[PDB]
């Protein structure tokens, strides 16, 4: 049940600005159930790839999370970054819109006129987001346990109880976050989940935008997000060490993981 694409990974290949595949993109002409979207895709991955939908936080737009689009697609994923219907949408709405974005990618995979026709294995999907978009991602995972992975950054929701989530979930937290503090948001969310592979990585000195486009720890954060998606989306056990390991970085001020098998 594995779906191995690309050269055997190395830390350097995961830390680079791109993986092995060329990336192209298009703007969704008629977004279905969300505000706007950009689809990033590998031109020649060598097989079908999973799809990932990424949602920003409150007041934010695609730019805040856009770096993940080419970063992940270049390793073998179709990635849709969205703007929400309103910048002021809350986590439940963000979840619905994230799942609408996945749905539309899945549909376009079956549409002959799309550049991503036949590129996607629609049985392998994942969710990502920042802050309220991260809370949205975890609501998506709670509601749709067939999702293969979640990677969220500085997550926030009005409740921290994600005890029903069984999807492999990586949380990036930001040490000095004053919007969604680690001790009242990211860490309670992490600690609520007992039935899944999970991981928590706290960036030293980070503000609430520490994982966003323009961040200075992208080599490490990108490596970890790509590795997590490769391991769990693709069931690619070549990525087990990279997905499960403590980074051993002066950039990281706390690291926790559970149920990630080597
Ligand atoms: K439907």
């Amino acid at each position: 049940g594995s779906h191995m694409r690309g050269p055997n990974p190395t830390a350097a290949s995961l830390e680079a600005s791109a993986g092995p595949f060329t990336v192209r993109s298009f703007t969704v002409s008629r977004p279905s159930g969300y505000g706007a979207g950009t689809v990033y895709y590998p031109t020649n991955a060598g097989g079908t790839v999973g799809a990932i939908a990424i949602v920003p936080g409150y007041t934010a737009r695609q730019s805040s999370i856009k770096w993940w689009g080419p970063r992940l697609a270049s390793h073998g994923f179709v990635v849709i970054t969205i703007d929400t219907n309103s910048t002021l949408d809350q986590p439940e709405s963000r979840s619905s819109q994230q799942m609408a974005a996945l749905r539309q990618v899945a549909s376009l995979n079956g549409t002959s006129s799309s550049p991503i026709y036949g590129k996607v294995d629609t049985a392998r999907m994942g969710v990502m987001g920042w802050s309220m978009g991260g809370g949205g991602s975890l609501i998506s995972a709670a509601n749709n346990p067939s999702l293969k992975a979640a990677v969220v950054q500085a997550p926030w929701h009005s409740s921290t109880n994600f005890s029903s989530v069984t999807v492999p979930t990586l949380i990036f937290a930001c040490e000095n976050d004053s919007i969604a503090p680690v001790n009242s948001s990211a860490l309670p969310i992490y600690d609520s989940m007992s039935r899944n592979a999970k991981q928590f990585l706290e960036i030293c000195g980070g503000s609430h935008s520490c994982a966003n486009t323009g961040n200075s720890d992208q080599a490490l954060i990108g490596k970890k997000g790509v590795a997590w998606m490769k391991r769990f989306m693709d069931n690619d056990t070549r990525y087990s060490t990279f997905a499960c390991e403590n980074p051993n970085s002066t950039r990281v001020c706390d690291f926790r993981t559970a149920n990630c098998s080597l």
Side-chain angles (χ1 to χ4, degrees):
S2 79
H3 305 263
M4 295 181 179
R5 305 306 183 259
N8 306 322
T10 68
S13 68
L14 282 167
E15 289 168 2
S17 294
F21 309 130
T22 294
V23 172
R24 286 184 176 187
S25 66
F26 66 86
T27 296
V28 176
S29 294
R30 292 193 64 128
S32 170
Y34 58 96
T38 307
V39 179
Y40 298 88
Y41 57 96
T43 65
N44 192 20
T48 61
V49 299
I52 297 166
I54 317 187
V55 187
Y58 196 82
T59 79
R61 294 182 168 85
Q62 288 178 66
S63 186
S64 64
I65 50 63
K66 178 183 296 170
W67 77 280
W68 280 119
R71 182 59 161 274
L72 280 157
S74 71
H75 286 275
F77 293 98
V78 169
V79 182
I80 184 169
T81 57
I82 71 166
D83 294 312
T84 54
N85 290 323
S86 171
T87 67
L88 306 185
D89 290 334
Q90 299 298 296
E92 287 281 346
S93 182
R94 290 177 187 283
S95 176
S96 294
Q97 296 181 61
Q98 177 172 54
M99 297 308 296
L102 285 176
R103 181 172 47 211
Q104 183 167 32
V105 170
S107 186
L108 287 177
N109 178 66
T111 301
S112 66
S113 60
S114 185
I116 59 161
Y117 177 85
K119 284 205 192 256
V120 180
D121 179 346
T122 63
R124 302 192 291 119
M125 296 194 129
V127 287
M128 304 178 56
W130 173 43
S131 206
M132 278 183 177
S137 297
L138 296 184
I139 292 165
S140 292
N143 286 321
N144 304 275
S146 300
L147 287 168
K148 296 304 201 184
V151 177
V152 300
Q153 56 200 60
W156 173 286
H157 184 40
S158 49
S159 173
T160 63
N161 184 351
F162 290 89
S163 60
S164 71
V165 173
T166 62
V167 176
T169 297
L170 166 64
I171 295 167
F172 296 107
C174 304
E175 187 191 9
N176 290 341
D177 197 325
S178 72
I179 290 162
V182 169
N183 286 149
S184 59
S185 199
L187 185 60
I189 290 171
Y190 175 78
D191 281 344
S192 73
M193 295 181 286
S194 68
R195 296 194 275 146
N196 58 339
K198 62 175 188 176
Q199 185 164 116
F200 174 100
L201 192 156
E202 180 190 80
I203 300 295
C204 294
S207 78
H208 184 56
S209 60
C210 83
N212 290 10
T213 300
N215 82 79
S216 61
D217 296 297
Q218 53 86 25
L220 172 57
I221 294 171
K223 161 172 73 179
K224 270 289 187 184
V226 168
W228 193 264
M229 292 305 206
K230 281 289 224 175
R231 171 65 187 85
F232 291 114
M233 318 227 59
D234 291 0
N235 204 27
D236 188 343
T237 56
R238 301 179 292 175
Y239 290 83
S240 295
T241 54
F242 298 107
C244 298
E245 72 187 357
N246 190 326
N248 198 304
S249 170
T250 67
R251 308 181 180 254
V252 170
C253 59
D254 190 17
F255 178 79
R256 316 172 177 244
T257 194
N259 309 352
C260 296
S261 158
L262 299 155

